[PDB]
Design a protein around this ligand. Structure first.
Ligand code: GDP
Ligand code: GDP
Lengths: 260, 261
């Protein structure tokens, strides 16, 4: 219930779930709503690593905006994109402090949801993101995409390889997912699934592309067979909780598999 | 010379150079300073597609900030990142007009230098970036990195695979490049060189690392070998002009290569 105070057993690993996605895919919404969902049964904590966001749909236990905001930095005459980078250079000075707060949380909660910088590139190309991720115990990364970017076959290969890239970069199990599935006509929904679920089929459609660019993508589906096999893409809705049971199951499974 | 009014033969294709890189990599400075270098000998045009840049070191022929800014939109109550996405959603209403203006520029100039949104992901994930790139004639993408992220062998893989991802998403030849090389000791420069361009010494190297990450890096890195005949890499300085000739040459090679067929 909203008023439940769920108990976490102190000598027990929590589940850290980290949401990553380009600006606008629904990171902050998914954290809040997946949080609510879990709160029926679990002790959840919320970490906001995003210095830009104007308002939160959840009460954070940790909030980097308490320390500095993009808006504050822009007051110093920085442009927005400059203020965003500058904001993570400043937080980096306080790295251990935040690393240790997050680690504390992980001892005190069943779940810790991390809502990452609004721009995925801050998290992936700045020292703050990767150094945090190196230092967290088996964090589970949910990489979400707006389905509206899936307009041609090689987009499906794009998203899949980007998740792999994220998994390389952050050194964490990355789950590729779609958000905003609430908006998907069911034809749209089955297309996406077929391309994602049927890599023989995907590969074949990419075979047809005559472009110089098409050949490379068709080829790039070397992912498979001898290592790199396509993992199931999750379909989520942060508005309706479609896929929340899935996500929760996956996150528990990942949790059982780790600590081994 | 720079003050010359260079003549471009209308029936003669130009070189379109697109600077892409994460925010802070030096996109805007590189675009400005490379153009100034080019301006001695060619007729250059500048396109700014970044709604969130405060000042330009160059005079743009095209400036999407004249339609809207991230800052203007934030005054509406959007956060920075909300406004960045919004600025480009609104920009889409003016898509053909921008496309057509740029298409004109390429008929009228030797070089069109395009300075992309400050957040790379804005360009890579937004319809405005993808469709523009789709509609340009053989643009050459230059993907710059800050050498500071290059700390261990796995990082070199990450950054070269990324470039590959840009190629694939944007459907254009993409040159992995380092910017800010002026800040590098000669010792630093040489480390970057053996890993960063030489991808037998990278692969080889990743192969020795028996960890999960090293394994996967090794794997993704070999897939690159078979996926493209390793491009030439660039070591630029937007500040001192190091690598400009090399960039200029690679552009000309790309130009001839796209010429015949
Ligand atoms: N219909 C629908 N809208 C969503 C969903 N997730 C997010 N949104 C909306 O998409 C916009 C971007 O969401 P936001 O959470 O800020 O994404 P962020 O930049 O990654 O943090 C907001 O207006 C959300 O209300 C979803 O699953 N379905
Ligand atoms: N030392 C050095 N600094 C650079 C170079 N290029 C850019 N910078 C600096 O890095 C900061 C980011 O430059 P900017 O063009 O705004 O990067 P952008 O966000 O990708 O457009 C600026 O303060 C530049 O002066 C370079 O080649 N060398």
């Amino acid at each position: 219930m909203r008023g439940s105070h769920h108990h976490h057993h102190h000598g027990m690993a929590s589940m850290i779930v980290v949401f990553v996605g380009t600006a606008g895919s629904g990171k902050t919404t998914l954290t809040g709503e997946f949080g609510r969902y879990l709160e029926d049964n679990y002790k959840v904590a919320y970490v906001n690593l995003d210095t830009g966001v104007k308002e939160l749909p959840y009460e954070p236990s940790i909030d980097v905006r308490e320390f500095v905001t993009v808006e504050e930095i822009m007051r110093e005459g920085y442009g927005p994109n400059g203020a965003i980078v500058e904001s993570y250079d400043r937080l980096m000075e306080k790295f251990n402090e935040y690393l240790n707060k997050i680690l504390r949380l992980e001892k005190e909660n069943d779940y810790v949801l991390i809502d990452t910088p609004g721009q995925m590139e801050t998290f992936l190309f700045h020292e703050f993101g990767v150094r945090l991720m190196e230092n967290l115990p088996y964090p589970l990364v949910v990489y979400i995409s707006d389905p509206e970017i899936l307009k041609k076959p090689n987009d499906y290969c794009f998203v899949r390889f980007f998740a792999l890239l994220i998994d390389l970069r952050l050194g964490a199990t990355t789950i590729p997912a779609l958000n905003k599935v609430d908006l998907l006509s069911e034809e749209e929904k089955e297309r996406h699934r077929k391309y994602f679920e049927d890599i023989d089929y995907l590969t074949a459609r990419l075979k047809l592309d005559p472009s110089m660019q098409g050949l490379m993508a068709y080829k790039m589906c070397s992912m498979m067979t001898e290592v790199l096999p396509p993992v199931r893409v999750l379909y989520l809705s942060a508005k309706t909780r479609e896929g929340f049971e899935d996500l929760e199951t996956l996150a528990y499974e990942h949790y059982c598999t780790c600590g081994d």
